[PDB]
C-alpha cells in the first residue's frame, strides 16, 4: 500500500538531544508516543523502495525466436535419450515419435 508507513505524524526531536535523529510520534499517553517512525529500519515504518505495480512483469520475445524454440523442442521430443533425460518412463512404448490412430 502506498500509505503503508505514512499514516503517522512524526517529527525529529532535534539535534542537541541525546537521542537518534529519527522522526518520533507525538502524543504522550500511549506506547506509540515518542517511538521512531517513517524509516526503513523502524518498526511499523516504511520499507525501502516500496514495491510498485510497474515492474515489467511481462517480457516481449520475438516471434521468430519463439518459433525457433518451439521447433527445437519438437526435435528434442523426437529424440529418444532426451525423454529419459527429462524424466519420462519410456521403456515399454516403441517409436518415440509416437503416433496413435486417428480413428482410435
Amino acid at each position: 500500500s502506498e500509505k503503508a508507513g505514512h499514516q503517522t505524524s512524526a517529527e525529529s526531536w532535534g539535534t542537541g538531544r541525546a537521542v537518534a535523529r529519527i522522526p518520533r510520534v507525538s502524543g504522550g499517553g500511549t506506547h506509540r508516543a515518542g517511538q521512531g517512525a517513517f524509516g526503513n529500519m523502524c518498526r511499523s515504518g516504511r520499507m525501502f523502495a516500496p514495491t510498485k505495480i510497474w515492474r515489467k512483469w511481462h517480457v516481449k520475445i520475438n516471434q521468430g525466436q519463439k518459433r525457433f524454440a518451439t521447433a527445437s523442442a519438437l526435435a528434442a521430443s523426437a529424440v529418444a535419450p532426451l525423454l529419459m533425460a527429462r524424466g519420462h518412463q519410456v521403456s515399454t512404448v516403441p517409436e518415440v515419435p509416437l503416433v496413435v490412430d486417428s480413428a482410435a
Binding site: 526435435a75 529424440v79 535419450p81 532426451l82 529419459m84 533425460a85 527429462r86 524424466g87
Partner: protein, 48 residues
C-alpha cells in the same frame, strides 16, 4: 542429421534426471551406466 551422441552429451552434461551431484563427486542413476559416474565414457543414454 541434426542429432548425435555429442549433441545429447552437450545438451545433457549439466542436468539430467539421473544426475546426482554432491560435494564428494557426481554420480549417475542410469541403469545403462556400468560405473555410476557422470562421464561421456559411461553415459549409457548418450552413447549410441
Amino acid at each position: 542429421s541434426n542429432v548425435s551422441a555429442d549433441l545429447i552429451w552437450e545438451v545433457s552434461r549439466n542436468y539430467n534426471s539421473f544426475l546426482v551431484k554432491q560435494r564428494t563427486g557426481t554420480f549417475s542413476r542410469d541403469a545403462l551406466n556400468l560405473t555410476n559416474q557422470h562421464s561421456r565414457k559411461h553415459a549409457g543414454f548418450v552413447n549410441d
